[PDB]
């Protein structure tokens, strides 16, 4: 029936990666970031840039033959934030609204089982 890729959406708070691979992830099909859609750094992670990135990703997927994708959303994780960035929701809605078919959705944010020391110092970053 359908041909599945894997839409690996990495939504940090400074950028948004929309990366579609095969099932294994060893073959990259399309990787469009929110920074390729705007010329200002402050909105590289904007929902608008993520939507444009997703539309370009869907267009590239269609001409290669990918008709459906599984979703692996992730935040920065590690010692940094575990909540996904603002662009991951827009890239997901744009992908679903672009004619690509959606399979399983999962959050794959890296979470330590403890961890290393987090930047900022003992008193945190004072603002």
């Amino acid at each position: 029936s359908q041909v599945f890729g894997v839409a690996r959406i990495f939504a940090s708070f400074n950028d948004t990666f929309v990366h579609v691979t095969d099932l294994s992830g060893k073959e990259t099909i399309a990787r469009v970031t929110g920074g390729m859609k705007v010329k200002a750094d402050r909105d590289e992670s904007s929902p608008y840039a993520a939507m444009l990135a997703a539309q370009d990703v869907a267009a590239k997927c269609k001409e290669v033959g990918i008709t459906a994708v599984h979703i692996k959303l992730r935040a920065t994780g590690g010692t940094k934030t575990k909540t996904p960035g603002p662009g991951g929701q827009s890239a997901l809605r744009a992908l679903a609204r672009s004619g690509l078919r959606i399979g399983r959705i999962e959050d794959v944010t890296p979470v330590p089982s403890x961890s290393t020391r987090r930047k900022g110092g003992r008193r945190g970053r004072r603002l």
Partner: protein, 214 residues
């Protein structure tokens, strides 16, 4: 300049016969050229596919199976079992407060010398007539449950081949046996084999793999 997608050839992924829906999906690779054959660079790849897809039933939506390709037959990829894991959301939906979480792991090799690490997880069960807020088991009880988990994973892995173990894992035979075996220690709920890891594989047996492919 070249459009690298004009040189991609599609292959079909075939799961072992232990599952139902053996048509995993499609992959691609650079077309076989003189310098690099597609076969050698395509075997050894690992695909992570949901067990609900491999079985049709939605009861397995929270478990995902890794299938490793180790033989190519034309445009067909012959994969093997590579590991088991729970989804992150499933584990997070199981780890509540006001209850005890008990975990165990063991390194054990199968009949065909497949070295695995098997991770078991369980939580304390609240009785229907219970009034108190929390459901905590004493650490001695948790040690007895952990020991029973370990000797059950050891027995139910060392006594069977990897294919039979996969057929045991799909219906949670081991989890049901751990839950039954720990009834006299403490009531438990959500007893699962939440992860299986391949550490070392035996020498490749194409005939044995082919028996797992029809």
């Amino acid at each position: 300049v070249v459009d690298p997608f004009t040189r991609k050839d599609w292959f079909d992924i075939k799961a072992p016969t232990t599952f139902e829906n053996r048509n995993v999906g499609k992959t691609l690779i650079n077309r076989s050229t003189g310098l690099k054959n597609a076969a050698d660079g395509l075997k050894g790849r690992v695909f992570e596919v949901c067990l609900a897809d491999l079985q049709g039933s939605e009861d397995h939506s929270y478990r995902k199976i890794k299938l490793r390709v180790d033989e190519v037959q034309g445009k067909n990829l012959l994969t093997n079992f590579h590991g088991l894991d729970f989804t992150s959301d499933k584990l997070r939906s199981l780890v509540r407060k006001w209850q005890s979480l008990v975990e165990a792991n063991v390194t054990v090799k199968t009949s065909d010398d497949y070295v695995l690490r098997v991770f078991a997880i369980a939580f304390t069960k609240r009785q229907p007539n219970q009034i108190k807020k929390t459901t905590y088991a004493q650490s001695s009880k948790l040690r007895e449950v952990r020991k029973k988990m370990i000797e059950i994973m050891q027995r139910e892995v060392s006594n069977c081949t990897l294919a039979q173990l996969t057929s045991k894992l799909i219906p949670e035979v081991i989890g049901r046996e751990i839950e039954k075996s720990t009834q006299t220690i403490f009531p438990l709920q959500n007893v699962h084999i939440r992860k299986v890891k391949l550490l070392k594989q035996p020498k490749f047996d194409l005939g044995s793999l082919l028996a797992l492919h029809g």
